[PDB]
Amino acid sequence: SLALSLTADQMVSALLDAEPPILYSESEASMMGLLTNLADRELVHMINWAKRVPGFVDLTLHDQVHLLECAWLEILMIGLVWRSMEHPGKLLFAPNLLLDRNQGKCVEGMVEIFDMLLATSSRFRMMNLQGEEFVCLKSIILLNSGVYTKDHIHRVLDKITDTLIHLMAKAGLTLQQQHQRLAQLLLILSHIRHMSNKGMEHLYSMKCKNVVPLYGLLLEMLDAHR
Amino acid sequence: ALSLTADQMVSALLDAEPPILYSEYDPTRPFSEASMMGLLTNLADRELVHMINWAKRVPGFVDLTLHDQVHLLECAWLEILMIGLVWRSMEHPGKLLFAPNLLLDRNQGKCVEGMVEIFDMLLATSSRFRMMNLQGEEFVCLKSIILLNSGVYDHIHRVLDKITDTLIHLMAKAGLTLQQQHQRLAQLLLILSHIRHMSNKGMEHLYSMKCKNVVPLYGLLLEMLDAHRL
Amino acid sequence: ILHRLL
Amino acid sequence: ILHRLLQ
Ligand SMILES: C[C@]12CC[C@@H]3c4ccc(O)cc4CC[C@H]3[C@@H]1CC[C@@H]2O
Ligand SMILES: C[C@]12CC[C@@H]3c4ccc(O)cc4CC[C@H]3[C@@H]1CC[C@@H]2O
Numbered sequence: 001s002l003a004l005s006l007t008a009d010q011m012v013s014a015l016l017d018a019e020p021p022i023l024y025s026e027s028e029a030s031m032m033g034l035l036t037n038l039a040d041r042e043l044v045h046m047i048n049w050a051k052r053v054p055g056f057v058d059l060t061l062h063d064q065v066h067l068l069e070c071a072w073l074e075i076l077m078i079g080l081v082w083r084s085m086e087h088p089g090k091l092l093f094a095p096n097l098l099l100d101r102n103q104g105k106c107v108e109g110m111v112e113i114f115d116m117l118l119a120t121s122s123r124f125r126m127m128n129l130q131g132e133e134f135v136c137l138k139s140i141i142l143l144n145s146g147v148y149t150k151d152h153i154h155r156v157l158d159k160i161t162d163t164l165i166h167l168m169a170k171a172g173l174t175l176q177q178q179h180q181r182l183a184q185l186l187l188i189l190s191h192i193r194h195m196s197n198k199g200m201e202h203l204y205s206m207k208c209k210n211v212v213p214l215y216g217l218l219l220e221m222l223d224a225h226r
Numbered sequence: 227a228l229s230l231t232a233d234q235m236v237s238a239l240l241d242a243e244p245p246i247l248y249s250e251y252d253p254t255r256p257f258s259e260a261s262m263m264g265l266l267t268n269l270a271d272r273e274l275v276h277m278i279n280w281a282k283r284v285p286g287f288v289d290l291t292l293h294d295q296v297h298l299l300e301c302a303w304l305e306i307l308m309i310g311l312v313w314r315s316m317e318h319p320g321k322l323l324f325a326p327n328l329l330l331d332r333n334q335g336k337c338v339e340g341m342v343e344i345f346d347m348l349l350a351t352s353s354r355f356r357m358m359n360l361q362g363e364e365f366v367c368l369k370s371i372i373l374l375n376s377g378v379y380d381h382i383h384r385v386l387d388k389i390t391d392t393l394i395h396l397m398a399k400a401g402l403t404l405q406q407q408h409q410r411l412a413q414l415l416l417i418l419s420h421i422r423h424m425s426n427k428g429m430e431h432l433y434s435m436k437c438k439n440v441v442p443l444y445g446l447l448l449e450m451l452d453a454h455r456l
Numbered sequence: 457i458l459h460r461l462l
Numbered sequence: 463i464l465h466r467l468l469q
Contacts, residue, residue, distance in 0.1 A: 061465065187415060
């Protein structure tokens with residue numbers, strides 16, 4: 001299982017190379033139609049990316065499915081927060097769809113979710129989050145979020161922890177600073193988990209109220225949270 | 227708080243721990259959905275009063291405005307109850323020790339609509355704590371991290387940095403290698419993502435029990451649930 | 457109530 | 463669908 005035999009540099013390289021492309025987009029109903037049309041196209045690329053996360057294709061088909069059903073909206077949100085880091089006060093859903101906070105209000109219940117995403121963006125900006133850190137965090141979300149619902153997965157997670165620490169050591173942080181930064185980063189995943197659960201309720205609500213029709217892949221990933 | 231050493235930090239946290247409370251379990255009648263939810267909410271409501279006193283004793287917490295204290299406890303209360311429940315349950319495989327007179331297995335969870343899935347997640351977390359050999363000194367650090375972190379999105383961040391230093395010192399003093407220290411720190415903090423998840427699912431559950439008039443919610447518990455604006 | 461108890 | 467795209 002050469003996943004477990006990767007150096008820190010080789011793990012970073014593999015994650016950088018696995019990264020999905022940035023896709024483009026195009027009332028309450030048109031805005032939701034844009035965002036879910038975007039999500040649904042991104043999900044297809046997320047499946048490819050997952051298969052390139054070292055260690056993921058070592059898992060059974062069932063476990064792969066489970067990890068992606070659990071994690072998909074976290075992974076979309078952490079991508080969105082990353083893209084938006086350099087646009088204080090805005091969410092870069094796509095290069096041609098850059099929404100300010102007040103456009104949140106065009107959709108019922110959406111502004112509170114935009115506020116949480118913008119606050120996470122702001123936190124990443126204040127920590128000066130690096131791209132190499134970001135691809136580790138995203139892989140940790142895939143492997144961690146459904147793992148408790150296994151040894152191979154914990155050993156892969158440990159290697160990604162070693163990789164994060166390697167990046168911080170290389171950047172010249174003291175040991176005390178590396179441990180502190182690793183904690184700050186991992187504690188953000190708790191906030192991402194919270195936003196995903198809120199966003200899943202919201203999506204389900206927009207579906208029920210026929211604000212937006214949901215089709216295919218997106219609908220099945222929503223339905224998995226039942 | 228910022229000038230405490232790691233050893234003073236751990237003492238203050240262990241010193242601050244709330245008591246284990248008893249439920250009002252009455253073994254003379256069968257459980258119904260309503261009576262089991264009654265027991266659990268009654269217990270929670272009594273624990274919340276002790277949680278408030280415990281938070282005031284968490285170094286750094288009383289330095290915040292009353293508004294910020296209220297927000298943090300509103301955000302974190304159910305995560306804190308759950309982590310306490312998972313900790314109490316560690317040495318009872320397959321059961322949840324809600325109270326010493328209320329030790330429930332997953333089949334008793336089935337008594338309340340939708341609770342069994344949440345019992346399963348709690349049992350899984352309790353098995354992870356056991357597999358990791360989570361120590362009391364680590365549990366109190368994790369519990370303080372939940373209180374300071376869950377609603378934080380600069381003084382808070384400094385106290386959180388101090389708790390990280392404290393966890394690392396604990397691991398070092400226990401003889402873990404430098405690499406084992408960071409690996410463990412990560413495994414501990416990644417469990418907080420799962421506790422957050424269970425808290426969100428538990429809050430939706432409690433809200434549905436309320437909206438279906440299964441159990442009356444009053445006072446502090448009612449207000450802490452309503453704070454989540456579901 | 458929470459504000460009062462704090 | 464997810465099953466199929468994963469294979
Ligand atoms: C799921 C939602 C629509 C799709 C949104 C999206 C769409 C594209 C993407 O790259 C990220 C996100 C994160 C926020 C998601 C939203 C949160 C609530 C809303 O219903
Ligand atoms: C909130 C619930 C009732 C109160 C329960 C409780 C009550 C006391 C306690 O110390 C821990 C917990 C965790 C699970 C909580 C439950 C999760 C769903 C249910 O509605």
